[PDB]
Amino acid sequence: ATIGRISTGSKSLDKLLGGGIETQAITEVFGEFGSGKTQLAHTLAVMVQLPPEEGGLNGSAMYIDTENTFRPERLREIAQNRGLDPDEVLDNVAYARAFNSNHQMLLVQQAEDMIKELLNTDRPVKLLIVDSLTSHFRSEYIGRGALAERQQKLAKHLADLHRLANLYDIAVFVTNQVILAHSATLRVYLRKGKGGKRIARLIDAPHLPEGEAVFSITEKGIED
Ligand SMILES: COc1ccc([C@H](C)NC(=O)[C@@H]2C[C@@H](O)CN2C(=O)CNC(=O)c2ccc3cc(F)ccc3n2)c(Cl)c1
Ligand SMILES: [Ca+2]
């Protein structure tokens, strides 16, 4: 099946990504707090709902929150400033707080039920966001010998997410706070730069060209 691409709102970042965030893939963004990772997660939740000539997939979003950083009014602001009805945009986001890593795994199973349900409608799920994906795994699996256990449990959770992405043609977007193995399709490092900008760099992506993207956090979410 054709790979769909969701615009980030930034032409610079979209170019770095090869056109946007891909369906049939897990894109991981990582960086320090305020680096743009979570602002990008909120922006994509709006952008996916747009028609393709506007950078979206005529889809809906699902958002797993692990550290209570989801802000519905921020989604409403981004939507309103892009010409969209804020409440209709918020209605196209399914939201869940993951209480712990085991609950996070169950939420991925439940996401499959909603994905299946909406698959052949005019607005299928096209984006599944997991914000600070590793937070509960780092809090719970700690101490002597915890590296192997944590990495196996994360590898399984990521394999579950890859299957949803591939089986249902959705984009899976995950964020993480800054030698460990990783299994996302594409990893993007974000940092603050000068002039209030954020800088993006692809990590271990020989398949994508050399460069860094520059973007701003605005009332439209993310843009150049
Ligand atoms: C202040 O106004 C609001 C208005 C809306 C929201 C969010 C966007 N919408 C909601 O919370 C809706 C309102 C009700 O219809 C239940 N609901 C779910 O989204 C319920 N979610 C689920 O049942 C559910 C299962 C499994 C899930 C699995 C996932 F991976 C991700 C999300 C998942 N979400 C917020 Cl945070 C604030
Ligand atoms: Ca952020």
Author numbering: 108 to 285, 304 to 349
From the paper:
RAD51 executes the DNA strand exchange reactions that lead to HDR by assembling, in a sequential and highly regulated manner, as helical nucleoprotein filaments on single-stranded (ss) or double-stranded (ds) DNA substrates. We have previously described the development of molecular surrogate systems for RAD51 based on an archaeal ortholog, RadA from Pyrococcus furiosus (Moschetti et al., 2016).
More detailed exploration of the SAR around 6 led to the discovery of CAM833 with a 6-fluoro substituent on the quinoline and a 2-chloro group on the phenyl leading to a further increase in affinity. The lipophilicity associated with these groups was balanced by the introduction of a trans-4-hydroxyl substituent on the proline ring serving to maintain solubility (clogP of CAM833 is 2.73, and tPSA 120 Å2). We attribute this to the truncation of the His residue back to a Gly, a change that can be tracked in the X-ray structures of intermediates from the optimization bound to HumRadA22F (data not shown). The phenyl ring of CAM833 sits flat on the protein surface with the ortho-chlorine atom sitting in a groove leading from this surface with both making beneficial hydrophobic interactions. The quinoline more completely fills the Phe pocket and the 6-fluoro substituent binds into a hydrophobic sub-pocket which has opened up due to minor movements in the residues lining the pocket. Using structure determination by X-ray crystallography, we show that CAM833 engages with two hydrophobic pockets on the surface of RAD51 that normally accommodate conserved hydrophobic side chains from the BRC repeats of BRCA2, thereby directly competing with the RAD51:BRCA2 interaction. Using dynamic light scattering, we observe a shift of the average particle size from ~40 nm for oligomeric RAD51 to ~5 nm particles (corresponding closely to the size of a RAD51 monomer) in the presence of excess of CAM833.
